[PDB]
Each structure stands twice: as C-alpha cells, then as structure tokens.
Amino acid sequence: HTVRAAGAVLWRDATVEVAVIHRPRYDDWSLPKGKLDQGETEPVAAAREIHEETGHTAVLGRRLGRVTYPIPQGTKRVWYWAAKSTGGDFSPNDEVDKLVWLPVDAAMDQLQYPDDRKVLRRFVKRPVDTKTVLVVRHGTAGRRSRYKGDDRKRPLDKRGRAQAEALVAQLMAFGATTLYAADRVRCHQTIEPLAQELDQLIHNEPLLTEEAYAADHKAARKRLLEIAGRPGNPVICTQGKVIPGLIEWWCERAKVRPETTGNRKGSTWVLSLSDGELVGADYLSPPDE
C-alpha cells in the first residue's frame, strides 16, 4: 500500500518568511503535510492540510518535489507545493501546538528533517510569487469516429464527466480565475463544472484545436502567450497533440525541467510564471488515476 500525502512551504511576505510547525506526537519541527482523504487529489489535500495545521488559507503555486519513506502500512509518498498565505491566523490544535514564521535561513535551521530542508532548498531556488497558467487535457470522450472534422461534437463519457467534476477543486487549489477552451465540445465540457463553480464564461479557442495547431503552430504558441499574459490565472483546456508540442517548446526556451511528464486525458500541466518567464512545469495525473 502506498499512502498518498501532500505538503507545502507556506510563505508570506517579509524578504519572505515561511511557516514551521511543532507537533507533540514527535516533538518535532517540520513542514505542514498530511494524508489525502477519500476522493481528494494531492493539491486539495495540501491546501486542506495547510488550513488544518496552520489556520491559513493559501493558493498553491510551483511544485517543489516529492518525499517517500517507509511506514508500517508500506510507503508514504508526499508531494510539496509552494503556497502563498491568503490570510488567517494559527491557533493550537490537535496535531500542531505551535507554529513559527521564519526567514528561510532560520527556517532551514529550525527544520529537523533533511527531507524538509531539501524541499525548502527547492523553494528558494526559484521565484515563488508566481502567476499560474493551467493547461488541461480534455477528459475521456469515447472512441474516435470515421467522419472528417475531428468529432467536433463528440462529448465526454461517464468517466470523463466525473473527471471534469473532480477537476474543479484541484484547479481551484491554484487560484484559477479565467477560462479558455479549444473549439471542441469535449474541451468545453471538461471545464464547464469549473465554469459553474466560478459562474464564468469559457472563451472559445479555434487556434488550439489539433487541426489549427498542425496548420499553424506558430499561431498557437503566440496565442498561448497572449492568454498567459492576461491578468488572472487562466485555465486552457486543449487536446493530446497540442500539449506536448506547446509545453516542450516552452520548457526548452525557458530552460525548465519538468519533474514528471505525461499527457493523459484529464491531466493538468501547472505552468508557473514569474515576470512573464516560465519558472515551472508540473504534470498532475488525471484526478481518478
């Protein structure tokens, strides 16, 4: 059995300070992390565990790596994110009796686990006050047909509609604010549950279908950057053949290493930007994988 968990470096502005917590169970000082509840994805687990353990609300940004260790049940895998506090206040709780805010150097000395210190070294290495473009592959939508036109009207199937529902919370954990979808029904349907949650329109993007991408790949790159440049954190739902071409191109020009890679239906690429430069590309599994 692998137990899945998520954690964060919770930070706020002064130049940045980060939260270290004390737990009486081990008398230790560590970074907030906890286990995924039923039906949760790692990003939601992180944000919930942060608010439970520290009393702060926060929006996740860049991913900061993974920690794996044995436990009596088997293995625990923990993924960490940088998380900006959006407010709140600590008070002693069941799991955590104290919390200190520390500049990074001091936090480095406070943290007793080498693995947390590694995570914190990832954190300081790149900017953390980032905006976030969220590139999503549309959910499962059955079989491809014989008819020309790339099944423009083909809808999500039952699993795909569920992936769409599951994505709402996951994408909300990155402070998603505006919505974009390639001119295919399945792409829109994948983010319509989020649109409902945010009560917002989805902007249609004919330049980001597979057809348009192959016919004019430069138009798509140029449009991806326009969207990214707009204020807010855009969600862009597109197709399998478009995603690798765009992400790989952007990672190579920015010199960004993706720690994981994939391209499954319902998966998300979290693209973190600082001053309009890509500083991160984080591949997340479909919510039901």
Give the footprint of Mg ion on this chain (CB under 5 A): 34-35, 49, 53, 95
Q: Evaluate whether 64 touches 119 at the Cβ level (below 8 Å).
A: yes
Burial of 64 (0-12, 13-18, 19+ CB in 10 A): buried
Looking at the Cβ atoms of 17 and 53, the one nearer to Mg ion is 53
Burial of 231 (0-12, 13-18, 19+ CB in 10 A): exposed
28 is in an annotated binding site: yes
Q: Evaluate whether 36 touches 5 at the Cβ level (below 8 Å).
A: yes
Residue facing Mg ion at closest CB distance: 34
| Minimum distance from residue 251 beta carbon to Mg ion (Å) | 32
| Minimum distance from residue 34 beta carbon to Mg ion (Å) | 3
Looking at the Cβ atoms of 85 and 163, the one nearer to Mg ion is 85
Return d(Cα 60, Cα 42) in angstroms, integer. Answer: 11
Looking at the Cβ atoms of 33 and 161, the one nearer to Mg ion is 33
Partners of residue 80 on adjacent β-strands: 7, 65
180 is in an annotated binding site: no
Residue 219 phi/psi, 5-degree rounding, is -65, -35
Looking at the Cβ atoms of 96 and 243, the one nearer to Mg ion is 96
| Minimum distance from residue 40 beta carbon to Mg ion (Å) | 10
97 is in an annotated binding site: no
| Minimum distance from residue 200 beta carbon to Mg ion (Å) | 31
25 is in an annotated binding site: yes
Q: What is the largest CA-CA distance in the chain?
A: 65
What residues are designated binding site for Mg(2+)? 33, 49, 53, 95
What residues are designated binding site? 23-26, 28, 33-35, 49, 53, 69, 76, 95, 113
